[PDB]
Design a protein around this ligand. Sequence first.
Ligand code: 38N
Ligand code: MG
Ligand code: MG
Ligand code: MG
Ligand code: MG
Ligand code: MG
Lengths: 244, 222, 196, 250, 241, 204, 243, 231
Amino acid sequence: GSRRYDSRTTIFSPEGRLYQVEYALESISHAGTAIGIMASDGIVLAAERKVTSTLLEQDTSTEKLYKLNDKIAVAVAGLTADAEILINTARIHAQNYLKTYNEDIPVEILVRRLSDIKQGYTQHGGLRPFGVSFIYAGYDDRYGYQLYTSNPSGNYTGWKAISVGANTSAAQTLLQMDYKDDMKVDDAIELALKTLSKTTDSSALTYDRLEFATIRKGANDGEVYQKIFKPQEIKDILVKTGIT
Amino acid sequence: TTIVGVKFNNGVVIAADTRSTQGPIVADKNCAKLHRISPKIWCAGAGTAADTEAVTQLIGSNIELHSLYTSREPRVVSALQMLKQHLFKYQGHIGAYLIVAGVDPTGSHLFSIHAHGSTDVGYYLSLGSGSLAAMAVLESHWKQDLTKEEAIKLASDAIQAGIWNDLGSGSNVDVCVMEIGKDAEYLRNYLTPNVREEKQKSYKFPRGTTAVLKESIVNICD
Amino acid sequence: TSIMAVTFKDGVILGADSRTTTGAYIANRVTDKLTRVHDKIWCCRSGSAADTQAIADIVQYHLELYTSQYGTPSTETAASVFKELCYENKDNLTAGIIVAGYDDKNKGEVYTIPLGGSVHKLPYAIAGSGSTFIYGYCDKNFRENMSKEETVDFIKHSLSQAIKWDGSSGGVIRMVVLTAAGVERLIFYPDEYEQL
Amino acid sequence: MTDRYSFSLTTFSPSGKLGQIDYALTAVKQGVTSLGIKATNGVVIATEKKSSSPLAMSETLSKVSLLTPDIGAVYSGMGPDYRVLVDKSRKVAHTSYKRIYGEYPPTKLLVSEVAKIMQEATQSGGVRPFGVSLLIAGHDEFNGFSLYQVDPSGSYFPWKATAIGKGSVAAKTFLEKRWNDELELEDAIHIALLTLKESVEGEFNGDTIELAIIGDENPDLLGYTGIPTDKGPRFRKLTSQEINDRLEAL
Amino acid sequence: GYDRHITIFSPEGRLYQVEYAFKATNQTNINSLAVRGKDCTVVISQKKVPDKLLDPTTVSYIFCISRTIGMVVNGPIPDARNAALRAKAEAAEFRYKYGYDMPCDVLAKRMANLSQIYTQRAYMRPLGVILTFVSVDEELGPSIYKTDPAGYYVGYKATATGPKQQEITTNLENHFKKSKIDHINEESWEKVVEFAITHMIDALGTEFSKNDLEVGVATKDKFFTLSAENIEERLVAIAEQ
Amino acid sequence: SDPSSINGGIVVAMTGKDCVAIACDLRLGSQSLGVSNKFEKIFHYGHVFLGITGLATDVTTLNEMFRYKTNLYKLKEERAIEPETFTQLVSSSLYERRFGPYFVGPVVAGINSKSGKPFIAGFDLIGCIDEAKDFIVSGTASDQLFGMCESLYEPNLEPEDLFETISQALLNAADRDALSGWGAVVYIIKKDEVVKRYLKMRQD
Amino acid sequence: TGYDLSNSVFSPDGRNFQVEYAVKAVENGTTSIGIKCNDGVVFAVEKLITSKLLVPQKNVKIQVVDRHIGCVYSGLIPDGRHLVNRGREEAASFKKLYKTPIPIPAFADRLGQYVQAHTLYNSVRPFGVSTIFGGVDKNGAHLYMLEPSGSYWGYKGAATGKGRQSAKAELEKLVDHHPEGLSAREAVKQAAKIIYLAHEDNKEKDFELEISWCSLSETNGLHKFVKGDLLQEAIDFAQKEIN
Amino acid sequence: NNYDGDTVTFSPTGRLFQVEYALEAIKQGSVTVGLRSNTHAVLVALKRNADELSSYQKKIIKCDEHMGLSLAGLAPDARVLSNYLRQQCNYSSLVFNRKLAVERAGHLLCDKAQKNTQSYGGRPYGVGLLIIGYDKSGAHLLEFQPSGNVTELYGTAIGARSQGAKTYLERTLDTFIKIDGNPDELIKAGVEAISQSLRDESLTVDNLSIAIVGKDTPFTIYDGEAVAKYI
Ligand SMILES: COc1ccc(C[C@H](NC(=O)[C@H](C)NC(=O)CN2CCOCC2)C(=O)N[C@@H](CC2CCCCC2)C(=O)[C@H](C)CO)cc1
Ligand SMILES: [Mg+2]
Ligand SMILES: [Mg+2]
Ligand SMILES: [Mg+2]
Ligand SMILES: [Mg+2]
Ligand SMILES: [Mg+2]
């Protein structure tokens, strides 16, 4: 019968790893680097686009950074289309929680459910895993500002600063070197851009090859604001830290 | 409601009053009972208000998709078959009573559909609470070989009979004309014989007449 | 509603009045109750208009698919498809159907399918509310192997009387002639049939 | 009997590639060239109607398809795959949008739905990816004019102008030279016609070229009058005659 | 290569199972041809009964799909009958759902879609057949639309299918270059049939008796096949010329 | 037993010159027993305002549902839903429950942010849209509101006048209905300020 | 290759090797035939007598469908039974809906479509039988033969199994020498002869002969088994001819 | 070889190897014999034990008052198939008040086994059965094989070395076929037949199993002291 053509996407190797998870991670390692840095007064998300053409429509574009609700955003490394499937799920999950409890969903709870969905594809159903790693940036009134990552295994962890995609090795070393606990958002912005600047596989880091977002306490008293940067705003903030 | 359909030389015309009721109360003084199924197939609907509207939109949507799939202009008989089979399935619980008309590559057409899913063919039809007042006029003045102008007159006269004599109909006359080889022309509020007379008095109040306990600015922004 | 079908020398004729009512209101005075489910297999419908149309449409579809695969269906086969639908769905249908067709082997045939979905092959059949009033008349005047003109007269006189006494019947008298020659539609107006 | 293929036919190789997606893209490479260009007041999508025999009537085979009155699509790759995607795309515009909001979806959201369908053929059990790339041009009230590319993975990107298939490397280079943010629709049609001459072998006339625009509302194409707010489809297919008129002044 | 056993892509972006289904198309070694008149659409196909034990009347590759649509198949008979039953059911359902007769081109698209599915979903094999649909459409007039195992389809001025298809194709293209029109400029279907048989004879370089052919004709409101006798009467008229 | 008149309540909306008003009473009762004096019946999603009368559990449920749907709309469309569009979403949502409906009388009010047009509409429990130039009424005192509106109303009232007119329609209608009243709230809505005022009214 | 390991896979020539392998199982089976006659059809089959211990006459192989159709087959016997069970369900459902007994051409396509369906998927195996069947309907007599591929045609006479060639040659002589027709009682005799002739290609074990027929005049258009005097009379006419 | 992975695959010569392997479990089975006269039908089965400490596995199962069977091969498969027969016999009784014809029992078993030889995922039954019964046309013996082939015989045997008993029964045919009106003489001939298939060993009291059904005799099974009469 059909057994002949089944790759068995959910088995252990003799070493006890999950082939498809490992191979999905290998795929992700060639994607545009994305960085998240957490400050005491906000969070930065910065990410590098995949080798652009001059004709790409840069301002109506989105590939790396998506809004999950008003208090939570993600940066994507991996297959964009796989990521959109998970993002819509996550958006719906957030609204169900709000509908049930009349309270915005705590960041971890959203992260956990998405990670559980990923985990399921590694244990049953015989389908390939999602080729995606996320950096979650969000705020809630229990833990304040939070960063997490998840990858195709459905494993998630919390961070002060983290990268995913290409060159995370170099990026993690650079972040470790210059990160400090008392840091502010505007310092974190600079750290994120300088780190991408040094790990990038292109000759120079320009506005048109980036996506950028902040999550600040940055409006009127106690309430949180998400800013997905327009191209001109990235151009300015690139000058303002002297990379161009 | 009162609604009608009248065939003529080179096409077909439909019309309707514009009253909507809830019990003895007029809910809407100028509703639209003429519905576009496709550009040259239009439907008049009486009965349960939302049912006429939903069934007409659903079939209109499926007709559009069918038209795209087949690369042809949709036919009135297709709308008729889809409507009748949908309504039959629901055993009259979808309370839509419809006059379906239009022009297609086959010619010009006029049908009626009852809520249980039975259909008729005719040269002149009427449905709704006012259908007996309208049919009185139609049976009195209809003839073989009507011009477009004669048909529009007959049809709006039939609706007028409903407006004046049926408490379930009122306000304005809407018309749609579907002629072979031309664009369908929808004549919204073709007749308006029930304009409110001027009021005797303005009831505009001295500012501050209303006692207020609190005020505040609502935040509609981000 | 008054309907009938009559076998004769050359085939079979179906006839019907043209009235459909909602209570005492005449919703349609020129209805066509004679409906084609195949080239030379027709039926006359009585009962719920929605039910009988739904049934006839399904039968027409079945016989068009039968035809595609197996050639022209017999009149018996058509009556069996009507029956299957009427019998299996007897709780939800109010349909009294007369089936009539012309084979070349079998000549004219008439099957009547009353309310419960039983089947009855007959020389002729009458049905509908108006039929009660002409049982006496039709039994007295029907003979086998009448001519086309005799059969048209029988039906015209029969339905004339059904129409006269039954308030739920009226309008024009329609007939469909089924022979080896083809299919012929007849119509007869009040001013003719009323004063027979 | 029944489908016992409930496992994925696209999976990760040890290098991280998804073989079937790569191979689908290869089928797209072999496909006939198609392109799209965004002007300030319109979008143009075009391709070559490469006919299979001259006994075929190639007007019966439309490569450029209306999806909604303001959205059109063209493709490169496997024609049959495209045809069923158009069928599904048209339907999803209704089921997942118009039947809910009483209006047609904005371009990016319809594109989003098509992309979803294509992504699922990349992960679901017992199917292969779609062997096509789409270019979808459209207009909607709050976003104006837009142009998107959708690939076999389900990924989509917005373009100022681009091309896909056979001669797409050369055609993307040509468009880089000629595109500016001030192009008026007529200029973009002319540039589209020039770019497409590069990649076409044989006859190059209005019977071998298929070209449509998303431009002004066309009241004459509506089919009825009397609703002031219904102004007509912005999608228009250029006729054989209209294409030739523009080829002499080329 | 398991990419050669099921309908997944090969490294060069090809579907081998679809290509091999095209090769099964010629298993019967029959050629078929279709042309349009003014009023009609004619299709002819070779009829070869090798075995003397066969009842020749049951050997056919032409099908009456509906009252108005005929279909000729190039490919093995079991797959051909499968396609015919499906097309018959689809045409009947269309009539019931939409209240008018299914157009030739729409049935062609529908069957082409079903074939597309077999090229994408692994558990279904493609059918090893090519299907030529013919009618005199009430909107479009005389119509020829053809389907293959790739799920491709298109309308034709005229067409041919089978092992010696190229010979017939070029023969027909040469006629239409000369005639400068879209069809056979002829009043009677009998003469359009005569044209079809005549141009099959030149192109294949063979003569036909009455049992070597099989003919289907579509007019307004019917599609029908010819008896051995109606064909003989047609062969006779070509000869006396 | 009649779900539309267990809890009580009313909503009314009116157009003016480049403005709209929507008002509601504050009562929530259980038949003759008044239970809550603070039960507001108007909600908003961005700049689109929705009033809902009828069975209170469905009022709450529908608010939570339309907040849900408009939040996802905004995330996917990247813009606030407009009143014309939201009105369609309300209609489809209600009709989807055709044979087990929400027992409600919703009312949409807002200004379209592109065109500047003031917009109001009402619905029956099953989704039939009633679009109106002048006013929409709903709830247990709807006869009374129809009477007040149809006589008090005139076109093109300035915001501060419309306030007086809508408030008097609501107050005097409520006082003729046993199940309406116990407080009121009025929203005056202009292109970009919205003022919310609580009226003083008889507490019986 | 490995194109032949899974049903429904096209080989590069365009063949389904699993069906062709099913044909080998058919060729390995005992001989069976049908002869179409004036107003009917006759079916016969060779039953190898494996052992003394088989009860003579009590291992019947020809099968009736409805009341007017006979089916015989060579190859895997259980597959043939499964196919006939399906044929019986198809005949019942036709009669239920349409009242008339299923026409033979109609019946032939029901079997054909079902057998063809078992070449569409890799999760089923093709039928390991060729089936000869037919009977009498309102249009006369019909004989059919159906292969593992689902291929079938109408036949003047037909044969399958180990002795198919010898039988085919024998059938061809009858078709040439009787262009006006063969009578039903005549066809029964010829059937016995051909089964005896065809038993040459299988002569290890000796055999038991079995015949059945439908004739408008001789069986009233119903399927019946030929036993008793008429069987022995035809056994004798066969004996006479091999000597 | 390459063609024996599952039952859904024909070999290039048209064989079904998984069925052939199921047939092989029968051949490793302990021997059993069937034979009948015109008035009775008898089963004899040599039961096998695991070792000296174990029971001797039952090989005979009653299906109805007038029908039963003996098994050779996988026992759980005999239990499944015998249970199906019990149900079929039972349905015939409850619905039609009619004892199931041994011949129909045979056709029903053939059809049940056949399904498992044409579909993916299932396997063939790995057991052979001998079915005896007395119905409205007298005594019957049936041989079932998991290929689906069922055959009516005067006598037969299956299992290891069943070839001896089968030759014996082939010679003895004319004798036993007319042991009418005599239970103990049909049995003794059956016990004799089975003896032609013994090696290193002979029939003891916890080793031999016999069943009989016939004209005025319910299907009954003898084991233990009640077979001593026969050794
Ligand atoms: C079975 O109960 C019915 C049936 C028909 C009517 C008349 C109808 N009015 C309505 O549908 C109003 C808006 N809604 C209701 O009455 C609420 N109903 C509650 C219980 O189920 C039905 C819905 C109405 O106004 N019909 C109009 C035609 C409409 C007008 C609105 C545009 C669509 C067509 C017409 O038939 C005349 C006025 C009387 O029916 C009322 C109750
Ligand atoms: Mg009913
Ligand atoms: Mg009367
Ligand atoms: Mg496939
Ligand atoms: Mg009060
Ligand atoms: Mg009080």
